[PDB]
Write a protein that binds this ligand. Structure first.
Ligand SMILES: CC(=O)N[C@H]1/C(=N/OC(=O)Nc2ccccc2)O[C@H](CO)[C@@H](O)[C@@H]1O
Ligand code: NA
Length: 617
């Protein structure tokens, strides 16, 4: 009824459009940085200028994707989005963002949240809904109306360099569940939500930012695992699906000549009709907006021309070509005209039926209608909008929420003989060991705060940043003088040197600092009977690098503290747990493969301890 009227409205609006305006809607560029007339190279775009406004009016793009560069402050963001909607000549823009929460956030002053895998660790599907709801509220106040979230890739390859903690789980049901509820949470605030990255990027060991990944599983495994959370959310009302620049020869074994080396490469799903029309649109029944992942990524740009990529995606069935060309000043603006003209030539010849363009643009208009983008609802002043958004974005209540989720997500994997919590006597020396300066700064700040607040006795603190370092006598001396030692380990792909089950602790350089260094610190604390706790900070699989430790947590998020601000809540939440000020309730959303005993799991999915009793939760 409202759905029936919305489809007729989109049809009428599109029937009244020129081919140029229709192709424009199908493009979503970024203007992350810009080099205005007179400037010497592209700077962060935080305020609108009449140059960028002129390409929006010229080309009538359907929307713009914002990056951190564009959204550093709430004040500046409300003004940019008002200003953008001001430049769009006929139809309100989709203003989109990667506010995933956790390790992928953009909003300068917003609530960052622990991230998907921390949500998986917390289990409860209402927390994913509350995250999607709070993000949705913050984006709304800011005038951003699209979120490229949730990632519903299933992270079942622990060597995954691009997804990892951006996934809820290695388990299809947990991911599906938390994915559906994030989506509902966003759609509830009128934010269009995109599932990504279809048909499932969770098994790759290559980053599609850097080259073209291959998933070689059959259709039966692909339907039961990778597709699963997509189908559930598509049925449930998914607004949009984002594609994956990844090859699936079980789905489409069409090859193309790589612009790079002339070689035969399997097509990336983004550019396959079999996957985007056959599978997604038809078998899977998705009639919402298909959007490319960024076409600037090397998985695409290495092997396909610029115009040629855009044309091949649309031919495959996508509605929106995301980041089709990077134009950073007025002198490169013809890149856009060239994509538009290539599409026109494709319509003219009939390689892309103009009716296909119509159906695609209708979808886009209809989403803009469905989510209240069009007509533009708000009649407040920019000044009023900035006052209001200032009270909502990064609000105290929102922080309370992020604090609670981050603390619950904390997973304790070992705590022998009540090593945790640390209850330090006054004047104890606490050694903080972490890869980077911001991480040691975060742990220090949380501790300082704990002292300030009379939660713990006064201790002195010392830092040790070990990225690219070799463990030297100066370091062991610090461990020796320490009363308590807290060490953060950081891995993406876990690749310690190991020979017949023995992690090689004889390496005397710092190529393998990420595994060899923290293991060195451990071995010195254990040799000297120092209270020692290992906190895994990114991918949890490094838990296998410390079987000797008596205490060991994972927090699923690695960003620390710079410029007076915590860039994630996960490290503070683990530090609270360590000092007794928080109750971790987390259980592993993934298996941790044994390092000493290849082929065995060390900690099963769903394993996690009660920090007080030491019994599995
Ligand atoms: C696999 C993945 O992380 N793709 C992301 C993504 N990947 O592309 C880039 O942002 N551009 C790029 C950065 C470094 C190297 C090559 C391309 O872009 C989309 C929009 O920004 C995100 O929504 C997608 O999640
Ligand atoms: Na991709």
């Amino acid at each position: 009824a409202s759905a029936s009227k919305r489809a007729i409205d989109a049809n009428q609006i599109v029937n009244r459009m020129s081919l140029d305006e229709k192709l424009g809607q199908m493009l979503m560029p970024d203007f992350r940085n810009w080099q205005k007339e007179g400037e010497s190279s592209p700077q962060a775009l935080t305020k609108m200028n009449d140059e960028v406004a002129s390409l929006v009016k010229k080309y009538q793009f359907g929307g713009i994707i914002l990056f951190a560069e564009n959204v550093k402050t709430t004040k500046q963001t409300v003004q940019l989005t008002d200003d953008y909607q001001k430049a769009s000549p006929k139809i309100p823009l989709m203003l989109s963002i990667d506010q995933e929460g956790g390790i992928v956030t953009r909003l300068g002053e917003g609530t960052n949240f622990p991230g998907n895998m921390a949500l998986g660790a917390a289990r409860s599907r209402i927390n994913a809904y509350q995250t999607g709801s709070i993000i949705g509220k913050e984006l709304s106040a800011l005038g951003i109306n699209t979120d490229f979230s949730p990632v519903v890739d299933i992270n079942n390859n622990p060597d995954n360099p691009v997804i990892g903690v951006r996934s809820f789980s290695s388990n299809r049901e947990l991911t599906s569940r938390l994915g559906l509820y994030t989506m509902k949470g966003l759609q509830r605030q009128d934010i269009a939500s995109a599932l990504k990255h279809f048909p499932g990027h969770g098994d790759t060991d290559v980053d599609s930012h850097y080259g073209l990944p291959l998933v070689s599983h059959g259709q039966e495994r692909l339907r039961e695992v990778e597709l699963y959370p997509f189908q559930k959310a598509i049925d449930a009302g998914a607004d949009m699906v984002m594609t994956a620049h990844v090859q699936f020869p079980a789905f489409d074994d069409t090859t193309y000549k790589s612009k790079l080396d002339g070689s035969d490469i399997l097509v990336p799903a983004t550019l396959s009709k079999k996957v985007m029309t056959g599978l997604l649109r038809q078998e899977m029944g998705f009639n919402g907006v298909i959007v490319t992942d960024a076409l600037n990524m090397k998985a695409i740009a290495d092997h396909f021309g610029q115009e040629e990529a855009v044309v091949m995606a649309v031919k495959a069935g996508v509605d929106i070509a995301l980041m089709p060309a990077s134009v950073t000043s007025l002198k490169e603006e013809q890149k856009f005209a060239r994509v538009i003209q290539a599409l026109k030539e494709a319509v003219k010849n009939g390689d892309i039926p103009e009716q296909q363009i119509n159906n695609s643009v209708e979808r886009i208009i209809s989403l803009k209608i469905k989510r209240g983008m069009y007509p533009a609802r708000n009649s407040d002043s920019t000044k009023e909008k900035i006052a209001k958004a200032k009270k909502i974005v990064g609000s105290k209540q929102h922080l309370k929420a992020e604090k609670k989720l981050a603390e619950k997500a904390v997973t304790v994997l070992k705590n022998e003989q009540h090593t945790l919590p640390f209850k330090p006597k006054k004047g104890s020396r606490i050694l903080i060991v972490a890869p980077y300066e911001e991480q040691t700064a975060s742990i220090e700040q949380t501790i300082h705060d704990l002292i300030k607040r009379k939660k713990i006795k006064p201790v002195s603190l010392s830092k040790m940043n070990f990225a690219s370092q070799v463990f030297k006598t100066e370091h062991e001396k610090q461990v020796k003088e320490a009363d308590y030692i807290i060490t953060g380990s950081y891995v993406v792909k876990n690749d310690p040197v190991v020979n017949d089950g023995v992690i090689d602790d004889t390496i005397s350089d710092s190529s393998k600092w990420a595994t060899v260094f923290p293991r060195a610190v451990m071995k010195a604390a254990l040799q000297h009977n120092k209270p020692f706790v290992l906190m895994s900070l990114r991918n949890p699989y490094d838990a296998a690098n410390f079987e000797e430790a008596k205490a060991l947590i994972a927090v699923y998020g690695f960003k620390g503290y710079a410029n007076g601000r915590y860039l994630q809540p996960n490290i503070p939440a683990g530090v609270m747990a360590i000092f007794g000020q928080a109750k971790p309730k987390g259980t592993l959303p993934v298996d941790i493969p044994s390092v000493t005993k290849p082929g065995n799991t060390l900690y099963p999915l769903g394993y996690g301890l009660n920090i007080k009793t030491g019994r599995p939760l």
